[PDB]
């Protein structure tokens, strides 16, 4: 849910910041509070926002 | 020798962003790229930036 001049394509979609990883399956960004909740909520693999 | 380490900002001390957790002992902010490694490199007690 991002649009109207976002100016930020490297941060959690909900917090909009404090995130450096994006779920490969969900194709969405998640902050440490979310990335850690997912990897703990079950079994998921996320990649770093870097190249 | 003794030095002051305070940071009112809420982001990694190195990346300066993409962080939502800080070590209580080191009193430093770390991003998902550093926090994940920190907990995997050693055992430290950190808390979420939320409150
Ligand atoms: Zn996911
Ligand atoms: Zn989030
Ligand atoms: Zn960092
Ligand atoms: Zn530490």
- In B, minimum Cα distance to A49 occurs at B33
- A28 is written with which tokens? 């969405």
Name residues with Cβ closer than 5 Å to ligand 2, which is an ion: A 12, 14-15, 31, 34
CB contact under 8 A, B32 and A33: no
What's the alpha-carbon Rg for chain A, to the nearest Å? 11
Measured CA to CA, the distance from residue B47 to residue B51 in angstroms comes to 9
The technique is NMR
| Residue spans per domain, chain A | 1-51
Query: What three-state secondary structure class fits B27?
Result: coil
**Dihedral angle of Cα B40, A23, B48, B9, to the nearest 10 degrees:** 100
- Angstrom CA distances, A1 to A5, A42, B5, B19, stand at 12, 24, 38, 21
Measured CA to CA, the distance from residue B9 to residue A27 in angstroms comes to 29
Q: Among candidates A46, A41, A43, which has minimal Cα distance to A23?
A: A46
């Amino acid at each position: 849910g991002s649009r109207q001049i976002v100016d930020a394509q490297a941060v959690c979609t909900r917090c909009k910041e404090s995130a450096d990883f994006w779920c490969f399956e969900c194709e969405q960004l998640l902050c440490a509070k979310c990335f850690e909740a997912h990897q703990w909520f079950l079994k998921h693999e996320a990649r770093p926002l870097a190249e």
